[PDB]
Amino acid sequence: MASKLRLQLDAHASIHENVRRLLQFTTSIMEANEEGIRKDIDSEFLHDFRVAIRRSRSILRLLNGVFDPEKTAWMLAGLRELGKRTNDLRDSDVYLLRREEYTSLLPPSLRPALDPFFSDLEADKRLHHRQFCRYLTGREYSGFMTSLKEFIAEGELPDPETAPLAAEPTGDVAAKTIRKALKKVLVHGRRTGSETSDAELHELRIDCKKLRYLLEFFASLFPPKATAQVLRQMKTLQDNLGTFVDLTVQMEFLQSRLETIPADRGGISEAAAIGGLLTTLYRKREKVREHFHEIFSGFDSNETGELFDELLTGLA
Amino acid sequence: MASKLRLQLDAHASIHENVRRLLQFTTSIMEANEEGIRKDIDSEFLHDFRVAIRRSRSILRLLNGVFDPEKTAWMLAGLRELGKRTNDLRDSDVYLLRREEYTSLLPPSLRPALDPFFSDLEADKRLHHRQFCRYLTGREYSGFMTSLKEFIAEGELPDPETAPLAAEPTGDVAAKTIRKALKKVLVHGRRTGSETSDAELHELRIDCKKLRYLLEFFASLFPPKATAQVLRQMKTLQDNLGTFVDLTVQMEFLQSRLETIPADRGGISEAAAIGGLLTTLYRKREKVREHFHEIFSGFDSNETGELFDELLTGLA
Amino acid sequence: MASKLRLQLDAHASIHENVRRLLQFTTSIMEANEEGIRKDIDSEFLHDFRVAIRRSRSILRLLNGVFDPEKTAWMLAGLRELGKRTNDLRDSDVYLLRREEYTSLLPPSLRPALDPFFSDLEADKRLHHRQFCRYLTGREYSGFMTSLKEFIAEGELPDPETAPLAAEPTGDVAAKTIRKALKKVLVHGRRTGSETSDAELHELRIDCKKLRYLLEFFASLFPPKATAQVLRQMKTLQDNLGTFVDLTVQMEFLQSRLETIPADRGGISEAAAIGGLLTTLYRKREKVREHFHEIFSGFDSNETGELFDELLTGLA
Amino acid sequence: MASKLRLQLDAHASIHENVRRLLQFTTSIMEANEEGIRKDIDSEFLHDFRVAIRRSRSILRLLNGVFDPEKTAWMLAGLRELGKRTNDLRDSDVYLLRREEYTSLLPPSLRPALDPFFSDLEADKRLHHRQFCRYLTGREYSGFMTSLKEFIAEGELPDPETAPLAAEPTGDVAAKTIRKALKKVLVHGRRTGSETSDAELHELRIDCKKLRYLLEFFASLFPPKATAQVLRQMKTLQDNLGTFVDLTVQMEFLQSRLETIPADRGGISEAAAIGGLLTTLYRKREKVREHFHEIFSGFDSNETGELFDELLTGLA
């Protein structure tokens, strides 16, 4: 319930006012999810907490200059540290949720060796849940969140010589940053020759995310159909890049677990099961890679250019 | 924004009161989505409209006896007719959204023959959108929705001899129907021998949906972690059955389009492209079928039984 | 050059005479391949040596009763022992030949862990080659082969009360055993319901091999087109069963290697690579299993019945 | 029985003498297969006939200069025309043999539409068999084969100024052409960047075939183990290129049939079935393409260089 909600923004208000409203929104989502994290109700609470952090940090970087550099660095560092504090707990949840999926991919002879693997994930989950709850109930977290909400409540415009973007009308900044983000997707996707490297796809996934975040933040400035059509136009490409990277992340996680499997007889069976998963995910990922070129060429169309022009029409 | 929202229910109120609150909720979602359907903002509006209808009808059947038989039949028939009125428009949206996905599956030589296919879908979409908007702005729709909201606002309990379930406490009905729905999933899944037929999987998908709908309707009666854990336990199985049936539905749609392709030279190329999609979806669906047995056996576990017992503890 | 060569048989000679000509043929192929085995020229020499053994043993069992029971048991036991003596050497050759195939299936991160695996196979190959060459140059092998060629050169018919089939005309025995072998394929394939178990497919593969061996042994008794058409009719089914079992055998080999991987850190990486291969072969094998029912139903046709009738016409 | 047979060559005889022995061999295989083609016993007879033609033409081009230019052109043109005369008949046989394979790939709903497709192939087969038998029994074929065997029986060395290679010792020509063919595989495979184009793979398949043909022609000049090891080293790469091109050829055949399917209602169903096959073969071919880079890099190794050096040692 964090990526599905939109703000009502005034296109004529300063970008400073509207980014502060964004951060009031995302910090409210953070705090609203603490109780569910603490009570370990469901994995979705930590996920929305993380989504709010990630969108906050990404917009703060895209709109660098709306706030003073010191305050910007401070918000980015505290939010980065907070997100990193959730990584181990988030990993435990995600791979536990994949247990039956992963088990079904393997031969029957290799399925039992995953049981100790998942029991160890459950033990990790309890450890990292306790650790992150002490963090959440701690003064250092309380202090950062209190300072952050106080700062974003400060409506006075910053020094324009150190925060040059702050006083700019929201519509102007939206037009300029969305055009910039679109150009970055198109240029980078066109640069993607035949090699279709891991690095290129990883970057382009982030390029598309930045574009999406901007569209969702500024949605209320545009006719709703126009925003919705641009988001739809991006979806197949984003799904291809997202699955490619997600499979990469899963393979990186499983590879790191191989490095710390016990070097003994029970480890051998677990290693074979983990190798089976790595290999199957690898094969899946190469099929996804095979489709990237067509899907991007279909995105890089005249209709796509026209839809962004129709979106941004009448802005400067 | 219809499948993600939960009601606050009183476990001690009559089931009649709480099912009326369900229907006030689902009808409100219906009406809230009319404007977006009419303005053709995005496909999600019709989807949530349909989800609200489908969950309303399914709960009304699961809880047959909360309302008088004539009123029950009337609500089911009007909601069925309303849903069926959305089918053609919904199909146009869904297969248009699949355009780049479908195009990427085919050899380059067959991709161009899909362009007239999708232009014809777009023409269908405009036709069915105009037709469904005249329906939405019509007196017959207005009249049904007005009568339905008036009926669900009538708080007097019905004749217990013709609506025997109405006066029952909500907690009792929840316990009995969730246990019944769970038993139906387990029995039917165990009956699924090696043949793993289309009919068996289609039925079991509906069995799982009924169970899920009941859990989501009655969620607020239980500790949140307990509800969330039961829903998570079901997810991999539901995803397997859901993909199996969804691929079936897509194949049935593409098969019906083959029957009406023009019997001429341009039709030949389109038919080859449609055959390529049918065949590829078929191959995907058989791999999904291959995983059903393992995924169900993993669902049909002692932990699953224990979680439902913990969910329903203290109820009768 | 053992499975591709046919004998010229006289349909009116006794089956005893013609099975002795078969065994003179297969033993000649055995001896002709010794030099290439000894000089380790290529893997094909041991393969043809094994093919000749396997076809000899299988026909001896199918035509039980052409020879006295003691001589039959003696030939079967000596040929079985000889074949088993080639298994380790044959395995080394086969999996060494699969090295690049296997390496290409794995993620880059798992490919290096196969290098010690294949170096150990090469060491095994040299060991088992030396062992089997001492065997080949030994008196015990020389003695068995000398006794076997002397026995098959003995043209006197055996005691008909202990070898009741020996004096039967070749055409009669061909007709009866080919019809019996065909019925066994059809019955067993029809018994294969939806479970399509490993045991059923393993058996049916052998049923088809026995039928093929009989057709190839008795080929010269029939019009060449008729034999060739029956063999072609069987091919797709035999290829499906053959790949199914071959993948099973490869998985069994890789599973046995997992059991003896060192329980230490270098073993962990090798185990992951072996698990990746096992899993990928497993997935391939389930797709092959998925096609069995259609392929068998296509073999179990009226045309197939008619072709065998045309093959055997005029015989009793 | 044409690609499996080797000549005994004298390394010190002129290349002219030994290429004439090659052509006596390949023409003998051609004539030996006429009867089986005429009686339509099995598809293998036309296949070996074609293999003999293809290897004859390829060696004649690789060793251009062993014969006078006019005689070389004459042999190449007559052999090319003869091979082309077999193409339609060969296609009928090959796709008829694929009937059950192709049928098993398709959804049940599309399988019946292939029956008229294969009945039409059978009708084509009978047509092209009758046509090619009139050709085989004709004076024009008889005359060419008589002239060809007379020419290859002419042992006098040709004019060295117009056939400069003829008098060269066989060992020298073998060393030079095998080294040249190997370099051409390695250079072209290394030039294959990430694009891995259809053209590049098609060419490299032919590069590998030329190398293989030379090794098999000159096999008896080298220690048998050395030849066998070089052929084994090439096998996985040749299998990858061979499957890639074979799938391409099958797709080209099915694409050409789409162009001539009747533009009417029965054609629509057949087109969908053909499109399903095209698409499935396409997907298979892209997976094969995905493995090319690894398989080639494994072939392009130090061991491969060393094995060719050991093969050619002591030659100039």
TrEMBL record, chains A, B, C, D:
Residue ranges crossing the lipid bilayer per the database entry: none
Task: Tell me which residues make up the CHAD domain.
Answer: 12-301
Q: What is this protein called?
A: CHAD domain-containing protein
Write the span of the intact protein that is present.
Answer: 209 to 522 of 522
